[PDB]
């Protein structure tokens, strides 16, 4: 799912991802009312746990620098005074 990319329409990709991470789905202890019990208010979105936010933080931070360094390689910069990331 994480790699399934869809653009242009509204879809349930995030919702599916959500239930795949839902403990009860994980424990197998599910009934036919599961959907109705666990998502009574529709799909309220998903939100990452510390150790998740943490890993993501680091990745974005890592990627951002990469991109930032590239802005630095613009032609026409002061010879000995380039931007330092």
């Amino acid at each position: 799912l994480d790699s399934f990319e869809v653009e242009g329409i509204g879809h349930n990709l995030p919702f599916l991802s959500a239930v795949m991470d839902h403990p009860k789905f994980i424990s197998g202890d599910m009934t036919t009312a599961f959907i109705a019990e666990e998502y009574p208010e529709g799909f309220e979105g998903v939100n990452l746990p510390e150790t998740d936010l943490r890993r993501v933080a680091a990745a974005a931070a890592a990627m951002h620098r990469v991109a930032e360094i590239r802005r630095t390689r613009v032609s026409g910069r002061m010879d000995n005074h380039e931007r330092r990331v």
Binding site: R70, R71, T72, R73, V74, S75, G76, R77, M78, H81, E82, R83, R84
Partner: protein, 506 residues
């Protein structure tokens, strides 16, 4: 001397810690904090930090702050030199005086002598009344400078507070005007005078707020959410611009392929001709890393103007939007693209024009409004432009509009066409009613006459037989066709007849 350090730090305080809070109170950053986020971390060199005004009227000489209301100097953006001035609202309202302007002129004069853009951060209460004509003269020297530099070195104006009176006319003449969503505004005459003379009661935000200007007046190029993104987006903009009219668009690395194919494109033009599509989809797919910095997005939405890169180089783009007014050309869409084209040309930025216009927007409102003149502006712009010009007609290219949209008669270089293109004098229907008068009383003749004009002229091939369309291509390959088309024009050099200047309609 640590005395120096004190004076320095004293100056840095502006109108004082109490006012600094007031400012922050309005969600507005300080003059210096704005400068701090604009320029490459620690690369700002300040000038005229201890400048004091020369006023003597109205006891003005008892309040002689350091800096006199504006922070000027230079620095770099991604290592490239840029000149800047940020008005310090906390100091005598960042009111313009003889000396406040002088400071701005010093770096404008420096930007020009060294070929580097000028970023203006306006956040001023307006002229310094006590100075009298000296405040007027103050403006004058800025204006003059603003004018001489037009199209010689990029002038990006940032409005982050009030901007009233003569003042507006400066940013007016710069190449870009960005505003900060709620904390900024600008108008020649104040709401209070609008009352006493129009009996109309309106609030500053209504009169000249970020929204009013980004979508009603045609004055601002974008309204940013707040001071921080405002500053961030400006550097983003600067990363595309050349440093002056001598060098060409900057170059940089690019993790994308000039030969990328977007098959999705092959079905972008809907079958039904009455169904729009978003011209912007195309733009993103063609654009390098899908990055598209849009100018005047929220205005004249029937046309799109923006910047993108290709093979890591800057390319300006003007394209019709079916989603609005059916991609019609109109006074405003015209004024909006016309200037964009001219700025891009004045600065050697190539143009990619994506076409799907039906004609111009009909109406008494348009004619009485002078489309004859405004409409021509865009035409004038492409006629004058000499940078490399590549065009791709996705669908509709009828009549006058067809010609205006970077046609081959305006000496564009590449005039590409998707098979769904239809270039013709006017629609099959109207065409028929004119060509076949004595046949209207026979609704099957005209029903058939149209069906023939349609089958014989609504396409790109008659134009191809003529050479007007250099080639008809498969939509998916556009990115590939256009990229190398420009690549091959990097050396383009064309000469317009000598003249002091143009006389384009106003």
């Amino acid at each position: 001397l640590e005395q120096l350090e004190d004076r320095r730090a004293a100056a840095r305080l502006g109108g004082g810690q109490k006012r600094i809070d007031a400012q922050h109170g309005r969600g507005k950053l300080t003059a210096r904090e704005r400068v701090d986020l604009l320029l490459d971390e620690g690369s700002f060199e300040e000038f005229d930090m201890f400048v004091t005004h020369r006023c003597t009227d109205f006891n003005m000489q008892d309040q002689k702050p350091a800096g006199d209301g504006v922070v000027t100097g230079w620095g770099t953006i991604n290592g490239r030199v840029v000149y800047v001035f940020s008005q310090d609202f906390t100091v005598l309202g960042g009111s313009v005086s003889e000396t406040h302007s002088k400071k701005i002129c010093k770096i404008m004069d420096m930007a020009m002598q060294n070929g580097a853009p000028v970023i203006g951060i306006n956040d001023s209460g307006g002229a310094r009344i006590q100075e009298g004509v000296d405040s007027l003269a103050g403006y004058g020297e800025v204006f003059q400078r603003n004018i001489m530099a037009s199209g010689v070195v990029p002038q990006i104006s940032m409005i982050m507070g009030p901007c009233a009176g003569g003042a507006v006319y400066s940013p007016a003449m710069t190449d870009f005007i960005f505003m900060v969503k709620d904390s900024s505004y600008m108008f020649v005459t104040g709401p209070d005078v609008v009352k006493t003379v129009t009996n109309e009661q309106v609030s500053a935000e209504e009169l000249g707020g970020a929204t009013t200007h980004t979508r009603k007046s045609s004055v601002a190029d974008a309204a940013f959410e707040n001071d921080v993104e405002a500053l961030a987006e400006v550097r983003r903009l600067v990363d595309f611009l050349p440093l002056n009219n001598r060098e060409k668009p900057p170059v940089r690395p690019f993790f994308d392929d000039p030969d990328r194919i977007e098959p999705s494109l092959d079905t972008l033009v809907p079958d039904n001709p009455n169904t729009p599509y978003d011209m912007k989809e195309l733009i993103h797919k063609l654009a390098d890393e899908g990055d598209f910095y849009e100018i005047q997005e929220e205005f004249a939405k029937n046309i799109i103007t923006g910047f993108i890169r290709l093979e890591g180089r800057t390319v300006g783009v003007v394209a019709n939007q079916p989603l609005v007014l059916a991609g019609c050309l109109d006074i405003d869409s015209s004024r909006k693209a016309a200037r964009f084209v001219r700025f891009c040309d004045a600065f050697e930025i190539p143009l990619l024009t994506l076409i799907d216009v039906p004609g111009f927007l009909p109406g008494t409102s348009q004619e009485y409004g002078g489309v004859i003149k405004h409409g021509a502006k865009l035409l004038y712009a492409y006629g004058e432009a000499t940078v490399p010009m590549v065009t791709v007609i996705t669908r509709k290219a009828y009549g006058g509009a067809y010609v205006v949209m970077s046609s081959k008669h305006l000496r564009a270089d590449f005039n590409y066409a998707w098979p769904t293109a239809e270039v013709a004098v006017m629609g099959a229907k109207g065409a028929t009613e004119i060509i076949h008068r004595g046949d209207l009383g026979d609704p099957e003749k005209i029903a058939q006459h149209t069906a023939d004009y349609e089958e014989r002229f609504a396409n790109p091939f008659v134009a191809s037989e003529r050479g007007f369309v250099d080639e008809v291509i498969q939509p998916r390959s556009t990115r590939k066709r256009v990229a190398r088309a420009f690549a091959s024009l990097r050396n383009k050099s064309v000469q317009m007849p000598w003249k002091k200047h143009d006389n384009i309609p106003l």
